[PDB]
Amino acid sequence: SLNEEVTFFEKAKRYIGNKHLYTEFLKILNLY
Amino acid sequence: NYKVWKKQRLINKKNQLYYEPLQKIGYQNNGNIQIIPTTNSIKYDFFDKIYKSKMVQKRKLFQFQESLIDKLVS
Amino acid sequence: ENEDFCSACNQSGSFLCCDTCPKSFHFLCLDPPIDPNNLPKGDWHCNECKFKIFINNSMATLKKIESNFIKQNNNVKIFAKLLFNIDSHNPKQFQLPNYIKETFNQDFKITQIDENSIKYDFFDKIYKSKMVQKRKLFQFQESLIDKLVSN
Amino acid sequence: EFALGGRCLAFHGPLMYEAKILKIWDPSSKMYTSIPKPQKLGEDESIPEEIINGKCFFIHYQGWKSSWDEWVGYDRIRAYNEENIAMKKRLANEAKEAKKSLLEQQKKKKLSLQIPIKLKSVLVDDWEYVTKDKKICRLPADVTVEMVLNKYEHEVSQELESPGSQSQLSEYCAGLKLYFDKCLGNMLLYRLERLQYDELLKKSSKDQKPLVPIRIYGAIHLLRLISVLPELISSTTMDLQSCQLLIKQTEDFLVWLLMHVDEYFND
Ligand SMILES: [Zn+2]
Ligand SMILES: [Zn+2]
């Protein structure tokens, strides 16, 4: 439970691939 | 009603100021931000910060349900 | 070249005349308690004088090493600006604050944010939203229980 | 000293005048001795209350009549010695310069913290103990700020709910500790404490461990740092929101102190 919570962000970054799409993803998460 | 937000237009380098917050958490930016690169201790700092907080939450859960069942007897 | 009164402790005594600034200090009114009759041999640059010749009185290199210094200590980040002024501060006697004595290019500034701060903010705000809706649901349930009990 | 009938030099406005001491007054006995025998004040005799609590002398100005005779305390009276005679000459020269300036002018004419009262009271009593008294804090200063910040975290974080807010709590604790260490030698020192700090730094070099002011000093110098913090922050360029965060952490740390002031601030 805890491990997935702390590991969610960089595994999402790994799934995103390109760093520009991850930059826009972090922009989305900031705008929220 | 509603609220609208529009991102700021791009400004040439002679009139555009990029500033770095001193406050890391909860800095109300207008939604207009820039991502800087992230430079091992920070990784474990995040791990304990979730532990503690979730623990406190459990405690917040456990402090209010006891008042609920102690209200039904009255 | 000298001052009649100590600019740190605000009484007259044994002084050390600085080269550029006319302010002088006692043998203890310094960050370090300079041992009298044992003062290092040299020009006697003070903290202000060492701050000016460290930066070579130019703004660009001083802002760049200030940003480098803030980059080093992100654990004390909100105080990191306040750690810098200290270097350019000539230690002085603790004078009480006044209230203690009693009884446009800046509008479109782009925020430079990092990934970890976005992660912390997203987690903070989702936890806030989830538990305020949970606690308001609990409060409405308790209020409805009290209403059904009273009726 | 002062004797009955002896010479004295006294204030009168800004200048010094010679006088005879005809009576010597004692405030404790409500009595004075005179020259042609203790006696109290008469029916028409009185002394101004500004000096009557101090030892008074009824004096008569030389070269001036008995209408100028008056009671003077130690503020207005001095013994007739060469130091007083010399400063009498000096003030005579000042009056001469004033007369010369009179001559010159006439000849030109012919041509966001709101802390409660208990922290203020304990801070001003520490001020009285550190300025009007030689007494300073104890060496190890007992409970260090280590303890305060540490437990303060252990209570507030278990009261704080978000992981984000606990990050700001730990961040503020670490920054306050490092600022205490790096600023105690810069502002957080008074008289008869510079020597104590010198003794501390010479003691630290003996056992090869580097010096540190967090554990060494007590929690009251930490409160001194919080007291100087509002004026200190606004000196340089600082944000709006970062400033508000800092005073908010300031205020809830102060009210957490206000929960148990008596733990760290009892004499
Ligand atoms: Zn001094
Ligand atoms: Zn200097």
Side-chain angles (χ1 to χ4, degrees):
Chain A
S1 177
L2 190 43
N3 194 5
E4 290 91 355
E5 285 239 349
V6 279
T7 325
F8 154 76
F9 263 90
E10 98 279 7
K11 89 154 59 56
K13 178 196 207 334
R14 174 101 51 181
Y15 177 87
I16 285 317
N18 173 18
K19 84 205 153 191
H20 312 67
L21 311 178
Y22 189 59
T23 286
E24 303 266 353
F25 178 69
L26 293 174
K27 282 183 169 186
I28 288 288
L29 285 186
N30 168 240
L31 270 182
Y32 174 69
Chain B
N1 279 10
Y2 63 71
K3 196 175 101 53
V4 79
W5 163 87
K6 274 193 291 173
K7 203 186 68 96
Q8 294 169 4
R9 312 179 154 278
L10 201 43
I11 298 189
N12 37 14
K13 309 246 189 27
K14 64 212 81 163
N15 301 329
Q16 173 56 64
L17 329 168
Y18 297 92
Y19 155 92
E20 162 86 20
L22 231 57
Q23 167 179 9
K24 306 153 70 214
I25 329 290
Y27 191 88
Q28 316 211 2
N29 50 62
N30 298 169
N32 305 304
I33 65 174
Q34 162 163 334
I35 319 281
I36 65 200
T38 299
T39 67
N40 213 6
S41 64
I42 311 298
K43 315 176 184 174
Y44 301 113
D45 183 314
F46 187 80
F47 179 76
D48 315 298
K49 218 65 54 193
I50 308 314
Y51 183 79
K52 298 172 50 58
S53 48
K54 295 199 300 184
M55 303 308 302
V56 176
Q57 304 334 306
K58 310 169 186 183
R59 179 214 72 147
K60 189 54 73 152
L61 277 205
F62 201 65
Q63 280 175 334
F64 264 40
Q65 45 194 150
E66 303 338 309
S67 68
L68 182 100
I69 41 155
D70 288 356
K71 188 66 179 294
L72 316 179
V73 50
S74 304
Chain C
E1 77 270 10
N2 58 336
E3 203 37 70
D4 203 78
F5 80 101
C6 192
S7 98
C9 77
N10 317 295
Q11 49 266 9
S12 307
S14 62
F15 295 131
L16 282 94
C17 307
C18 183
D19 46 338
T20 80
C21 49
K23 42 175 163 291
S24 56
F25 293 133
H26 293 161
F27 282 78
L28 308 165
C29 295
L30 297 172
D31 292 322
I34 174 57
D35 40 12
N37 196 10
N38 196 3
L39 62 80
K41 327 298 299 183
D43 164 5
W44 163 228
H45 276 341
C46 80
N47 306 302
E48 316 311 298
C49 291
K50 84 158 69 64
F51 198 82
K52 322 331 171 193
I53 49 56
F54 199 27
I55 69 197
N56 320 303
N57 52 275
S58 88
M59 70 145 262
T61 190
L62 84 82
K63 311 202 151 203
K64 93 193 182 63
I65 47 88
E66 181 284 359
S67 98
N68 206 342
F69 179 73
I70 300 183
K71 184 64 169 182
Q72 293 301 136
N73 45 14
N74 44 2
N75 309 356
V76 316
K77 185 82 172 306
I78 188 90
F79 282 97
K81 182 82 64 57
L82 218 57
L83 309 180
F84 218 84
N85 58 43
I86 302 184
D87 301 321
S88 183
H89 283 355
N90 261 358
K92 66 176 180 179
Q93 190 79 295
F94 188 79
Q95 273 316 10
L96 271 188
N98 227 27
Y99 72 107
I100 299 294
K101 297 174 178 177
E102 295 175 350
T103 188
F104 278 5
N105 304 313
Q106 286 85 226
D107 222 334
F108 276 0
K109 227 155 48 174
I110 299 206
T111 282
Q112 268 164 351
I113 208 167
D114 62 87
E115 170 186 329
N116 205 237
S117 50
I118 288 189
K119 181 188 312 173
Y120 273 139
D121 289 16
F122 170 69
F123 263 115
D124 164 36
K125 199 220 75 160
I126 64 106
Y127 273 140
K128 283 312 192 333
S129 92
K130 147 172 114 159
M131 202 171 347
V132 297
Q133 62 93 9
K134 158 208 305 299
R135 279 183 291 184
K136 82 160 141 185
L137 160 72
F138 188 82
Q139 286 324 96
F140 299 152
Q141 172 190 7
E142 164 75 14
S143 74
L144 260 295
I145 281 173
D146 297 357
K147 281 150 199 167
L148 265 66
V149 158
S150 65
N151 286 337
Chain D
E1 50 163 51
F2 301 93
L4 276 175
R7 270 177 295 183
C8 63
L9 302 170
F11 286 147
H12 194 95
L15 302 181
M16 296 299 103
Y17 306 96
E18 203 185 305
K20 293 179 179 179
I21 299 166
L22 312 181
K23 312 169 191 171
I24 291 181
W25 167 265
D26 200 312
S28 307
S29 55
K30 199 74 175 69
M31 182 278 288
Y32 60 93
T33 62
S34 303
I35 53 173
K37 37 167 283 189
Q39 62 170 299
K40 309 201 75 178
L41 278 171
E43 294 88 3
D44 56 353
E45 293 182 293
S46 53
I47 296 178
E49 293 293 297
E50 293 85 16
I51 56 167
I52 206 176
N53 63 6
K55 197 174 301 170
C56 297
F57 308 90
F58 194 68
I59 58 162
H60 171 69
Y61 287 100
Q62 188 178 4
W64 286 82
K65 287 192 295 294
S66 66
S67 81
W68 295 98
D69 283 20
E70 59 167 335
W71 293 95
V72 296
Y74 291 169
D75 184 23
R76 293 197 59 178
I77 203 164
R78 278 80 63 194
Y80 192 83
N81 52 350
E82 172 55 40
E83 298 84 16
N84 291 322
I85 300 169
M87 61 79 71
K88 171 178 176 178
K89 300 161 193 163
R90 187 256 181 193
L91 289 188
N93 299 341
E94 304 298 330
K96 169 185 179 180
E97 293 302 317
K99 170 189 175 181
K100 183 63 69 178
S101 306
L102 173 64
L103 193 143
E104 293 154 359
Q105 64 85 0
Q106 68 89 30
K107 75 176 179 54
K108 292 188 289 291
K109 188 256 186 180
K110 185 66 59 181
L111 178 64
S112 172
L113 255 76
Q114 320 277 96
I115 66 187
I117 54 198
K118 176 151 42 60
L119 314 172
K120 308 274 248 205
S121 73
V122 73
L123 204 162
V124 300
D125 78 38
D126 170 81
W127 195 33
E128 295 296 315
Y129 307 167
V130 77
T131 45
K132 313 296 179 53
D133 194 2
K134 177 259 169 185
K135 174 180 56 180
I136 73 164
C137 328
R138 286 179 168 88
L139 313 182
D142 289 345
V143 167
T144 59
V145 298
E146 183 178 2
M147 324 314 298
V148 61
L149 300 191
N150 303 355
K151 57 169 300 189
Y152 162 75
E153 179 140 49
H154 187 279
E155 187 173 323
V156 166
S157 63
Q158 279 78 331
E159 288 287 90
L160 264 183
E161 293 177 350
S162 285
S165 301
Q166 296 177 191
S167 304
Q168 323 194 50
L169 180 63
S170 175
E171 212 284 338
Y172 183 76
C173 282
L176 202 53
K177 287 186 176 182
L178 199 91
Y179 199 76
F180 189 68
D181 286 348
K182 203 254 193 201
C183 201
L184 213 170
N186 201 98
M187 291 96 78
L188 325 190
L189 271 192
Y190 259 102
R191 270 326 190 185
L192 259 290
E193 323 180 338
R194 324 292 296 231
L195 172 58
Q196 186 70 63
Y197 195 31
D198 177 33
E199 161 61 65
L200 262 48
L201 60 97
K202 302 197 289 323
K203 191 170 170 325
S204 68
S205 54
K206 288 158 186 172
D207 52 86
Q208 211 258 340
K209 295 318 122 172
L211 185 59
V212 42
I214 275 299
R215 45 190 50 89
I216 288 185
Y217 269 62
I220 164 175
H221 284 255
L222 170 58
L223 200 290
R224 189 182 258 91
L225 179 57
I226 326 292
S227 68
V228 55
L229 223 41
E231 176 253 294
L232 152 63
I233 280 187
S234 191
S235 55
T236 80
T237 77
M238 189 85 167
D239 289 345
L240 313 100
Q241 321 212 63
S242 90
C243 264
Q244 308 277 17
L245 178 53
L246 273 188
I247 40 184
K248 190 212 73 53
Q249 288 300 119
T250 303
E251 289 272 8
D252 55 23
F253 180 68
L254 287 157
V255 306
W256 185 89
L257 285 180
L258 291 163
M259 155 195 199
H260 51 100
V261 176
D262 307 352
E263 178 49 44
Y264 313 112
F265 296 76
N266 274 347
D267 301 358

